[PDB]
Write an enzyme that holds these catalytic residues in place. Structure first.
Site, PDB file in Angstrom:
ATOM      1  CB  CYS A 107       8.288  -5.826  29.482  1.00 22.54           C
ATOM      2  SG  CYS A 107       8.670  -3.999  30.468  1.00 22.54           S
ATOM      3  NE  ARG A 110       8.892  -7.870  26.563  1.00 24.76           N
ATOM      4  CZ  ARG A 110       8.427  -8.735  25.085  1.00 24.76           C
ATOM      5  NH1 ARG A 110       9.431  -9.726  25.407  1.00 24.76           N
ATOM      6  NH2 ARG A 110       7.672  -8.964  24.560  1.00 24.76           N
ATOM      7  CD1 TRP A 279      10.816   5.005  31.674  1.00 24.11           C
ATOM      8  CD2 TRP A 279      12.676   4.445  32.748  1.00 24.11           C
ATOM      9  NE1 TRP A 279      11.483   5.216  30.834  1.00 24.11           N
ATOM     10  CE2 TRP A 279      12.631   4.775  31.581  1.00 24.11           C
ATOM     11  CE3 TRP A 279      14.151   4.264  33.429  1.00 24.11           C
ATOM     12  CZ2 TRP A 279      13.833   4.599  30.346  1.00 24.11           C
ATOM     13  CZ3 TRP A 279      14.813   4.202  32.431  1.00 24.11           C
ATOM     14  CH2 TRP A 279      15.018   4.250  31.346  1.00 24.11           C
TER      15      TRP A 279
END
Ligand code: HEM
Ligand code: HEM
Ligand SMILES: Cc1cc(N)nc(C[C@H]2CNC[C@H]2OCCNCCc2cccc(F)c2)c1
Ligand SMILES: Cc1cc(N)nc(C[C@H]2CNC[C@H]2OCCNCCc2cccc(F)c2)c1
Ligand SMILES: C[C@H](O)[C@H](O)[C@H]1CNc2nc(N)[nH]c(=O)c2N1
Ligand SMILES: C[C@H](O)[C@H](O)[C@H]1CNc2nc(N)[nH]c(=O)c2N1
Ligand SMILES: [Zn+2]
Lengths: 403, 403
Positions: A107, A110, A279
């Site tokens: 990710c 994060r 998003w």
């Protein structure tokens, strides 16, 4: 034993000591590194994964080593003792979901991990209730285009019975109709999931951006079909800031990235159905989905659009046009007032996150090859920063396709 | 399937297994607990390594188990028996050099592994003489633009006696002069070696693109300084095919990439000097040495000339400029008739190399992070290709700078 971790832009140096708390083998061994593969091919265990996870939560709210903690530690000890399992309290499950996101090595968002809307949908017992839950998650998460981070946890796996599952990999994604002439209308990556949808008796359109319906499956029941009502689904047309024609292309993408096939693991318990969303980073739409050759693969058409030289690689038409698409994605979302983030802003905030994490835990595990954008790699500061991958729990895993 | 790393190409859907990695006899940086993929710098034993090398050689000439094979073995044991070390037959040196480069997981260049000029320089006894060997190298390899792969091999390490050693990281590098107001004029990469040249007698320039002298070392003698005759060192003035103003930036690079500080290890023999060279990939220059924040850092300048909005990330002024700069590298080299290759073609052909190696050896060690270019990553096929990285010998290997 603990690794030196340099930044090659600033000659700065840290030390991961978090990875000391990894209880899970990844794919590498001292003989080869498998780090670039995408996929990886008992009461005494559960009780110990729990204990620990309880320990994270009490420690999280500073109430470690006390009454409410000790007492809650017999609660699980006794629930496993008797029934081979236990359940989480809402706030506990709110702590794990957040943390599962904190620990997701792949990710780039994060930094946002503290700010997560957690919908507890564990009192769900049909696909029809799933659909509703999912439908709310979307209305909430979309927010007239001011996107908001959200997850919705459905009921956990149980040893005697099939799982609650969402068959789709995302909640929104587009039809991919394979054609006689070997070709494909729409997204090639969702061919098999479109077909599966037709086999369960969906009426299919035939455009390039037919939004797929939803296949929700409750324990041991055949999956069921639910068309998402068009108004929960926010779409964004593609135009260019200077290129008049770009628009006339019919390109458009949806606003909400919601992963719906991954398993969520807290305290040794497993939530087979727990879709989540935030998003998009522009490069997910602009580079991967429109740009990949096994996807929408529009590059050559953009390039011919622009009247560059198709005939040779060393004129750089691959790169010039890609660039305009990521520019088209960013422009277009900014005009629609939809939350988007470019890969420069994104990775920059990711560095802050590592620094934030370095002080908070002693490291952050991350997967270099997934964090570094698919264009302009070295132009982003994450290129120049060494990283570590290991496996922390709570965690999102992959899981088999339910068919 | 088989218990050998399964390796997938996600664009094409294709699968292979890597059996080669079983021949790795030397551990890298990872374990099951954590992946270190991203880290840039991750007698009885002699005989053991040599035997494996000789086997390797006789194999490559199909004479494995033969009279000549068991004879060389006994001969090599006896060599080591009385002297501690042994010496390579000429053709054994040519093959291990090629094998060392074929085994280089960080090189995208490997399709050309079989076409290398091997200059035996094991007769060299002075620093004066290296300069000479080296000058022949550059002459040969530069071949007036039509560039040619080559490696010159200086005497191996030896008990007691100290090493031969080119101190420069590359045979050709621009100076890096530390200003009295913090900044650097020239390549910041080279401040340390520039300072050493001056300390050792060199009168320095005052430019962005000054070619460094050579600091050559011979066993136990102080390093000695040798200037390259300008006529020998081919450079390319940088121009853009459509932006007329670009030429005026005064930008230039040199034609020959020639690594000079690596160790070449064969059969446990170590060659501490062995400059090797090939031809550039456009992104080594366009994107790395010119656009790195910690190198020439020319991205902002160029973007201003392009009239781009440099106050917001979301304009992709970085991406736009790096493309132009890379295009101008590619075009400057084309026009001067100097061998170059753009990330696109260069990777298409690493794909081919991968398929050849699959057939020949069952696999190919590859550092994904390095094989994938610093720009347009996902836009090249290697992006979609899982790789297995392990260490095979003969190898190139890093060594500590000599000072
Ligand atoms: C809010 C803004 C967010 C951004 C910009 C973002 C961005 C990304 C990106 C770019 C990736 C990898 C991209 C790819 O698939 O190639 C990713 C992966 C991932 N994200 Fe985030 N994300 C966001 C929010 C979240 C949230 C809310 C969660 C869950 C609570 C999450 C969990 C994950 C997980 C588990 C992965 C790994 C996927 C895998 O291993 O296949 N992200 N994210
Ligand atoms: C033929 C044209 C060649 C091309 C296009 C090429 C390309 C490259 C590239 C792009 C890299 C990565 C460098 C970086 O960005 O730091 C590399 C690394 C490397 N190359 Fe090749 N190369 C070529 C010839 C050669 C030759 C002739 C040799 C040896 C004889 C060689 C051996 C190596 C080695 C050992 C590395 C690893 C350096 C490290 O690990 O840091 N290459 N090559
Ligand atoms: C929550 C969130 C926000 C955000 N910006 N981005 C994301 C990643 C999403 C969107 N863009 C890709 C998708 O990632 C989905 C997870 N990745 C699957 C990779 C894969 C592919 C094929 C077979 C496999 F086994 C695995 C999540
Ligand atoms: C033979 C050949 C051909 C080619 N195209 N390209 C090459 C790599 C050369 C050129 N372009 C970079 C340099 O590669 C040198 C490899 N070392 C860099 C990693 C490193 C390690 C430790 C400290 C550092 F500062 C940096 C060789
Ligand atoms: C094989 C390689 O691991 C695979 O192509 C990865 C590379 N990096 C990625 N990075 C992100 N963010 N998402 C991806 O799908 C991939 N794909
Ligand atoms: C942190 C990371 O390992 C480092 O910046 C690497 C990434 N990939 C690279 N790839 C090449 N070809 N050359 C490099 O210097 C680097 N640098
Ligand atoms: Zn690894």
């Amino acid at each position: 034993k603990f690794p030196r971790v340099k930044n090659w832009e600033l000659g700065s140096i840290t030390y991961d000591t978090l990875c000391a708390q990894s209880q899970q083998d990844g794919p590498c061994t001292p003989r080869r590194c498998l780090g670039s593969l995408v996929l990886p091919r008992p009461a005494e265990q559960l009780l110990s994964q729990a204990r620990d996870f309880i320990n994270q939560y009490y420690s999280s709210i500073k109430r470690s080593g006390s009454q409410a903690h000790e007492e809650r530690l017999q609660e699980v000890e006794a629930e496993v003792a008797s029934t081979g399992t236990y359940h989480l309290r809402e706030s506990e499950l709110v702590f794990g979901a957040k943390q599962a996101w904190r620990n997701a090595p792949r990710c780039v968002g994060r930094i946002q991990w503290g700010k997560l809307q957690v919908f507890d949908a564990r009192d769900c017992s049909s696909a029809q209730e799933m659909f509703t839950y999912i439908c709310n998650h979307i209305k909430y998460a979309t927010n007239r285009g001011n996107l908001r981070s959200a997850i919705t946890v459905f009921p956990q796996r149980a040893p005697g019975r099939g799982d609650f599952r969402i068959w789709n990999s995302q909640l929104v994604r587009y039809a991919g109709y394979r054609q006689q002439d070997g070709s494909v209308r729409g997204d090639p990556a969702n061919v098999e999931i479109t077909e599966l949808c037709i086999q369960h008796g969906w009426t299919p359109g035939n455009g390039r951006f037919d939004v797929l319906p939803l296949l929700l499956q409750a324990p041991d029941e055949a999956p069921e079909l639910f068309v998402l009502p068009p108004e929960l689904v926010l779409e964004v047309p593609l135009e260019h800031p200077t290129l008049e024609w770009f628009a006339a292309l019919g390109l458009r993408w949806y606003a909400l990235p919601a992963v719906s096939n991954m398993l969520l693991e807290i305290g040794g318990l497993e939530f087979s159905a727990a879709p989540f969303s935030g998003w998009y980073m522009s490069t997910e739409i602009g580079t991967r989905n429109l740009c990949d050759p096994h996807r929408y693969n529009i590059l050559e058409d953009v390039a011919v659009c622009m009247d560059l030289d198709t005939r040779t690689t060393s004129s750089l038409w691959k790169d010039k046009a890609a660039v305009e698409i990521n520019l088209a994605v960013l422009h277009s979302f900014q005009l629609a007032k939809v939350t988007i983030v470019d890969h420069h802003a994104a990775t920059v905030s990711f560095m802050k996150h590592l620094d934030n994490e370095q002080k908070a835990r002693g490291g952050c595990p991350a997967d270099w090859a997934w964090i570094v954008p698919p264009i302009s790699g070295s132009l982003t500061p994450v290129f120049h920063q060494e990283m570590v991958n290991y496996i922390l729990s709570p965690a999102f895993r992959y899981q088999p396709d339910p068919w």
